[PDB]
């Protein structure tokens, strides 16, 4: 949507041709490296069909495979944290009220002499396994 605004300002110069094939292409040069990392994320999520926290770990491998070009992994770093924004609104519910409501379970849970061992890792955290134990 934010890309489409800048284009409509280019379309306001395009009322007659004073832009050549190279001219608008020159504005797309910084944005070239940007558009292909969002492609590789989008097709990697479409192929394997992950869900929950295994997506967010998948997004961290995308941050590792790009490494270098720090200005243009920084944008996709904001993408994986905006994704962790619904992963945070569900997290507080198990630890500060007990009573958890997840849409279809997106944050790992197994509800509880003894009563069952319990194990929780079902959705898999995007960080090391000691947090799942904690």
């Amino acid at each position: 949507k934010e890309y489409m605004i800048l284009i409509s300002q280019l379309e306001h110069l395009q009322r007659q041709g004073l832009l050549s094939l190279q001219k608008l292409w020159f504005y797309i040069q910084p944005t070239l490296r940007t558009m292909e990392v969002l492609a590789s994320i989008a097709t990697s999520l479409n192929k394997g069909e992950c869900f929950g926290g295994a997506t967010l770990s998948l997004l961290h491998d995308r941050t590792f495979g790009y490494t270098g070009d720090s200005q243009a992994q920084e944008l996709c770093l904001y993408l994986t944290k905006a994704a962790s924004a619904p992963y945070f609104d569900i997290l507080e519910r198990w630890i500060y009220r007990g009573i958890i409501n997840d849409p279809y379970s997106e944050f790992m849970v197994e509800e509880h002499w003894d009563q069952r061992y319990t194990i929780v890792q079902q959705q898999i955290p995007s960080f090391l396994q000691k947090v799942a134990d904690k």
Partner: protein, 236 residues
Amino acid sequence: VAEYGTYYTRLSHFSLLTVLDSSHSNGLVFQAFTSGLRKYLQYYRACVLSTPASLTLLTISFLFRKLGRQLRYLAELCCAFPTGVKLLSYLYKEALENSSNENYPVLLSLLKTSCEPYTRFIYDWVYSGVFRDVCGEFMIQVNEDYLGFRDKRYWTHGYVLISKEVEDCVPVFLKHVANEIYICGKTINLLKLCSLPVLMKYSVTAPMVSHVYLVNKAIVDYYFVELKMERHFEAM
């Protein structure tokens, strides 16, 4: 001048093949050379946009006389084929040279961008203990953490370059500091879990001397209160 335009299609041929959304075995540093390289390419594109008026072929060949001496160096440094930390030493060598006074700042420009992933694994290794290199070319270590040993937190942890024993090619020079970011990188986490190219060289040196001394004044305090070492010496 067609030959001058042929070295511009080499740069663009090389930059589109050295991206790591087509590889994940080739260096992060190798990618970092391109982030600076692509800025000379758009610089060319506004200057090709500025070649009209041309009343003769000379007003243009003479305009690129200056960019021509440079493009031949700056094109054929790539041609051998240096990669990784060996490429990062190949630009730093060329940045130590100046002779040519317009081929000097572009290789200066490349040197600032190309050390950005390299330097990133240094300051995190001496302040936290995480060496975040696990992908691409360059020396990958994560070190073999041991809780069974407590003798510096480790008993295997190779060296930071596991065959040459060297680190190089970034302002300072890393032929002293390199042996000491080693010894302080073990112990920072022993606290935790139980004008000239030579002028700018002398401005980095004392900061790299400062942080090892700052890390040494934390592990010395940790020693005094937890070892009671003088008491073991007295007992011996």
